[PDB]
Amino acid sequence: NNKSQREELDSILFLFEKILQFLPERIFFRWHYQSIGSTLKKLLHTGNSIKIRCEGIRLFLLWLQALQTNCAEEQVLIFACLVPGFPAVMSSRGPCTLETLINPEKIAEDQTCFFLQILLKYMVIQAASLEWKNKENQDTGFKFLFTLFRKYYLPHLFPSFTKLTNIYKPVLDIPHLRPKPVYITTTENIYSTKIPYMAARVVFIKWIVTFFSSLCSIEEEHRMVYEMVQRILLSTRGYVNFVNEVFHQAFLLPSCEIAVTRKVVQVYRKWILQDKPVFMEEEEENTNVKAGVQA
Numbered sequence: 001n002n003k004s005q006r007e008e009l010d011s012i013l014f015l016f017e018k019i020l021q022f023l024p025e026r027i028f029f030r031w032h033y034q035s036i037g038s039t040l041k042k043l044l045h046t047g048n049s050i051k052i053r054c055e056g057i058r059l060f061l062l063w064l065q066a067l068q069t070n071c072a073e074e075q076v077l078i079f080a081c082l083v084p085g086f087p088a089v090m091s092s093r094g095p096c097t098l099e100t101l102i103n104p105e106k107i108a109e110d111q112t113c114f115f116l117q118i119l120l121k122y123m124v125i126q127a128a129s130l131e132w133k134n135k136e137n138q139d140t141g142f143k144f145l146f147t148l149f150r151k152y153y154l155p156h157l158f159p160s161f162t163k164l165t166n167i168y169k170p171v172l173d174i175p176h177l178r179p180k181p182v183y184i185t186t187t188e189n190i191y192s193t194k195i196p197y198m199a200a201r202v203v204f205i206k207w208i209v210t211f212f213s214s215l216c217s218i219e220e221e222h223r224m225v226y227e228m229v230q231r232i233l234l235s236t237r238g239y240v241n242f243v244n245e246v247f248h249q250a251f252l253l254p255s256c257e258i259a260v261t262r263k264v265v266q267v268y269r270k271w272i273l274q275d276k277p278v279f280m281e282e283e284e285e286n287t288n289v290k291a292g293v294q295a
Helices: 003-022 024-028 033-043 050-070 073-080 098-102 111-123 136-157 199-210 223-233 237-249 259-271
Strands: none
Touching (some): 024 050, 223 237
């Protein structure tokens, strides 16, 4: 291999991205399905650098986004095993990971956030043409991706996830006390908790909050698309309930890394007693929320 060869393979990846963007309808018609799958599997080689693996994951995400709901079982299984460190997905063949699926600088299981930020800003590159297409294709791909992520990764990420929060039919109870998790007080000495899969919850809640605190438009190159994804997050009843439930899951984390809760406090300060969005203006049923502020 050479730097010229590295640039050639990067240009091959860029041409792959361009051919996915320029021809979404052809991809939706499973064009070169076996060839695309083989190319993705070859590019998903774990023996290369972190950049190569990230590019392969990005290309796989774009391919499944353009394919929408036409992805087969192996695409879903690969998608469910894209981020390592998670338990092997219970498939028909059996437990498996990405390494054994493709083969039938230390990673700190932080590839979840990189994967999520790749999914976000590359869903918004809008492989949908919008010509010979419709405006609905802007929202459909991201809705499908969010639904799949919530179906697969969310239940394991949130072991305490449950369905209580709902503005419509507002059933309310009285919360009670909770025990104290053990703090190892190890490694200024920052603290942590022995409960597995907690940093993933912190990252997920922080990202959800940053989409809502969603101020100052620092990036300035992906801001209209952030507004688009904000509308997607608040454009349906189900996503409304999901946002309320993730906020309820917030404020429940242990004392370690509690600054995320204050972010939710700032979000609610911006919402109530301030500019009130359509979210509080007075199964998905209607796009308009029209939820009373009292509930």
